[PDB]
Amino acid sequence: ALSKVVIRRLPPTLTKEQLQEHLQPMPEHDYFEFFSNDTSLYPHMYARAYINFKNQEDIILFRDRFDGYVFLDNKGQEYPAIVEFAPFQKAAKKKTKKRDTKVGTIDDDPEYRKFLESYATD
Amino acid sequence: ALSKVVIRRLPPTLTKEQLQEHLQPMPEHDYFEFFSNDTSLYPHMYARAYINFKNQEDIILFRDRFDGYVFLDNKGQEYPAIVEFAPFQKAARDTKVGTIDDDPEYRKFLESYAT
Amino acid sequence: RPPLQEYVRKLLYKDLSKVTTEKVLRQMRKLPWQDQEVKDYVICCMINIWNVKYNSIHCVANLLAGLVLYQEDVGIHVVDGVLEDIRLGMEVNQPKFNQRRISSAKFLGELYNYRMVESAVIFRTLYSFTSFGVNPDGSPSSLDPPEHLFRIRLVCTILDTCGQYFDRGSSKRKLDCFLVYFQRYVWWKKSLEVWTKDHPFPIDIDYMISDTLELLRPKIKLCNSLEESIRQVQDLEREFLIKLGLVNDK
Amino acid sequence: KRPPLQEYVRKLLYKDLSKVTTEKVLRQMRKLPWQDQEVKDYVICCMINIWNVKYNSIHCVANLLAGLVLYQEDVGIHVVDGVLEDIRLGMEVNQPKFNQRRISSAKFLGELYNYRMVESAVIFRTLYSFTSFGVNPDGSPSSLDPPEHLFRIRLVCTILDTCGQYFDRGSSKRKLDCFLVYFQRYVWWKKSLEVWTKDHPFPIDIDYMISDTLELLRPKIKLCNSLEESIRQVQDLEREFLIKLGLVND
């Protein structure tokens, strides 16, 4: 059953903390991520967040309480938020495995080092 | 399943022989008859007919030929006909049949009626 | 009019009010049902049920329920004739036919009460009240002008006649689904710009709706808004989508 | 005038992915500081901006991400969430200068299904939104769908070009069959607008785009020659939905 909820068209300057501050009391959830400024349609910038609910009777209250809730940006502009089911219902599931032993090794990689000099003579 | 079809909003003076004159060749059917002048909304008088088809495919081509088919009345007025699935899909002995002729309470009624 | 033909108008439009229904039935098994013209005359008489006073229309459906055990086609033609008159009533839609159209809808409800039609006939008629000639966005149309609230009266007439029997089984969900669409239709009308403080929505229609909805579902949430009405339709259609497997599986 | 680590990520995705093997690119991508949230977000944003990638190499990006999720599992979910967010925002903005970017992301989403990053539910969810979001159930033009705006047809055809070939067996076969019925009505809604005359004819390249795409997926499909024919198809199909849902019978 559908459990992933997106709240979108939030102000592009908002933070995850300001959003949860407006969201309390927040129901129980597995998932709570926050994205912003990652669109390809500049300068139409917005923020969004995804929440995956444990029980699905909370979503109807969450929608009835926040679909239309007006947020404000840095300059007083109104941002009526939209609350819908996320079109992709898959959500992250903990830290399943250990780290890839190669992450953070690009700083000493030879191929990346030759690029740094070509970036000195751009 | 769904097999009973109504053709309605026909001219009020159209008859059944004339209607199947336009419908021929008629597909395979069990029931097909024709009613008229039976409404409570006089003077908005129309006619209609119901058909029960034997095959599901005969209907998709029957309504494609006659939904919108314009009929004509006595004095030229047009009557575009409608073909839908009938709302009531059910389609159509006794010994006391025809015995109120020669029946007492009927006979008492008729003398109350003469005055 | 001939003697026999006014003999029926006594049997159906006068006697059925203050007489045993079981006595007049054998008096119409009396009739020459082989004769197609008099068989046609009284199918027409029952179709014109607007002659009967309102609170005895169920007695006519009580009579007709007994005859179809002897001349079953007479019930088929009356049911087909009443359903045709309800459709033509929406196409004519002249206020001078209101009492007749209300009686016809009431008759169809009583015909379900005596098992002449199944629930599918009632629910087809009910959905046709909220959609036939209706624009899918709620905009006023040719057959449903803004101040025309007769579809609501037609819905309420049938629901008050036969809706109490949709309390269990499949008919409980069929009614529950239709009430979601009925509440959106009601709010489509209430939101038209014709209704102002000077020209308010008729308060007697509001009471008629709440009576019909409180009689069928004591614990139903009356949507106090159009968006509240629209979101419930979206929620219901989302479940329709899932069971149809149009984006998902199974 | 850009941080070197940012230019390197753009080099891997926007330059190297077409020229070198994607596995060599994956070897370098794993070495990035994925434990830094800013870097992880830049790579995600780089892939949402798929319009920077040549159209013929967009599928190499999905092939790269499908190996990246073996080491950074959550990255593929964020990229999908962002691409679907951009597709919805594109219809809300709907400025013609973003036509190539919105075509790219639609092509990307189809490729993401081809490499099993999303299942058919996401694809069909997006396909139906192209024919319904900001679209009147009337078929009349909207502010988000003005009459000469035919970008929804090209968005639909872009996705069907990329991933539609796989919807030929099983439950996805029926899902496409139902959608193409609704798509042929949407097409004939646009063709039915008054704006299309002999002086201002419907664009014939859109016509060929439609039949080219539909003949690539279904060889025996019937292309509707009228709006009435497309409406009859939707009505017959919705009659089947009604029979299966038991809203009137059952």
Author numbering:
A (entry chain A): 49 to 170
B (entry chain C): 49 to 140, 147 to 169
C (entry chain D): 768 to 1017
D (entry chain B): 767 to 1016
Could you pull the original sentences from the published paper?
UPF3 is a key nonsense-mediated mRNA decay (NMD) factor required for mRNA surveillance and eukaryotic gene expression regulation. UPF3 exists as two paralogs (A and B) which are differentially expressed depending on cell type and developmental stage and believed to regulate NMD activity based on cellular requirements. Here, we report two crystal structures of the RRM-L and N-terminal region of the middle-domain of UPF3B and UPF3A bound to the MIF4GIII domain of UPF2.
To study the architecture of UPF3B’s middle-domain we crystallized a construct comprising UPF3B residues 41–189, comprising the RRM-L and the N-terminal part of the middle-domain (NOPS-L), in complex with UPF2-MIF4GIII and solved the structure to 2.6 Å resolution. In good agreement with the predictions from AlphaFold and homology modelling, the beginning of the middle-domain of UPF3B adopts a NOPS-L domain consisting of a linker followed by an α-helix. The area of the structure spanning the RRM-L domain and its interactions with UPF2 align very well with the previously reported UPF3B RRM-L–UPF2-MIF4GIII structure displaying an RMSD of 0.44 Å. The following NOPS-L linker region is composed of conserved residues D148, G152, T153, I154 and D157 which form multiple polar and salt-bridge interactions with R796, K797, L798, and Q794 of helices α1 and α2 of UPF2-MIF4GIII. The subsequent α-helix in the NOPS-L further contributes to UPF2 interaction, primarily through hydrophobic contacts with P770, L771 and Y774 in helices α1 and α2, involving UPF3B residues I154, Y160 and F163. Y167 additionally forms polar contacts with R768 of UPF2-MIF4GIII at the end of the resolvable portion of the helix. Using SPR, we determined a KD between UPF3B-41–189 and UPF2-MIF4GIII of 3.6 nM, which is 200-fold stronger than the KD for the RRM-L alone (720 nM). In summary, phosphorylation of UPF3B’s tyrosine residue Y160 or mutation to aspartate results in ∼40-fold reduced UPF2-binding affinity, likely by preventing accommodation of this residue into the hydrophobic cleft formed by UPF2-MIF4GIII.
